[PDB]
Design a protein around this ligand. Structure first.
Ligand SMILES: *[C@](=O)([C]([N]C(=O)[C]1[C][C][C]N1C(=O)[C]([N]C(=O)C1=[C][C]=C(C([O])=O)[C]=[C]1)[C]([C])[C])[C]([C])[C])C(F)(F)F
Ligand SMILES: [Ca+2]
Length: 240
């Protein structure tokens, strides 16, 4: 997250860190959202790779014991069948992970609330991105979970020539674009939390940024629109 602020420990309890094994240690690579005690939602492009993964829930600081972490292996990965490897702009950038064991819920570990199917946010809706991703273009990962206010940019504006043009599909959400705040590498797969009728719900899965950098004016961060995939989510969970 570029332009972020440090999140409180208990603000975004559905956020997870998705890590891969690198020799003897584990490294953060993506975010995700806990959606059942044994299922995580993330981006397809995080998990279509030759790596071994684990999930950490209750995480705050990647490099220090928080006293709240639960570490769980990943037992099954289901990528959207229409995802095409390394083609983010085609969409379908979503995957579900069944965890090897159910996690326990507490003030640091809660399920993300999903929107109702088909829900679309008004332009300029209030949302926050969260993650441990780079804090500057070509920078380094955050140690502590960051948040940034990233209001939505609706489809009619986002798909206009001055923004993302025909790159953006209606199955995506755009947020931000002020040139100061954005997602960045390592935020992929995590939530976009938007305040609707008094409740934060996870409306986006962080997907991609511009070829010109993370924080680029009129190039909002682009997210998979969760509300376009609710039937798919429920079908996968029911079948596995
Ligand atoms: C995420 O944390 C990370 N996402 C990315 O880095 C994604 C994954 C593939 C590459 N990517 C990008 O965001 C890159 N953008 C594109 O590849 C791209 C831009 C525009 C178009 C088009 O058609 O208009 C097509 C592709 C940029 C150049 C890095 C973050 C940024 C959310 C993780 F992948 F884990 F690093
Ligand atoms: Ca920690």
């Amino acid at each position: 997250v570029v332009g972020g602020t440090e999140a409180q420990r208990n603000s975004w309890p559905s956020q997870i860190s998705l890590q891969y094994r690198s020799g003897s240690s584990w490294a953060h690579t993506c975010g995700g959202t806990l959606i059942r005690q044994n299922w995580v939602m993330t981006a397809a492009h995080c998990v279509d790779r030759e790596l071994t993964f684990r999930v950490v829930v209750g995480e705050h600081n990647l490099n220090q014991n928080d006293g709240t972490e639960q570490y769980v292996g990943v037992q099954k990965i289901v990528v959207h069948p229409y995802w095409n490897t390394d083609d983010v702009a085609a969409g379908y950038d979503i995957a579900l992970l069944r965890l090897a064991q159910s996690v326990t819920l507490n003030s640091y570990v809660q399920l993300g609330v999903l929107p109702r199917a088909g829900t679309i946010l008004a332009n300029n809706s209030p949302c926050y991105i969260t993650g441990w991703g780079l804090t500057r273009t070509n920078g380094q990962l955050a140690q502590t979970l960051q948040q940034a206010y990233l209001p939505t940019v609706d489809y009619a504006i986002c798909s206009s020539s001055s923004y993302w043009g025909s790159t953006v599909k209606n199955s995506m959400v755009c947020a931000g674009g002020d040139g100061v705040r954005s997602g960045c590498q390592g935020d992929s797969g995590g939530p976009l939390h938007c305040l609707v009728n008094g409740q934060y719900a996870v409306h986006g899965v962080t997907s991609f940024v511009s070829r010109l950098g993370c924080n680029v004016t009129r190039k909002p961060t682009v997210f998979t629109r969760v509300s376009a995939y609710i039937s798919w989510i429920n079908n996968v969970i029911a079948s596995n």
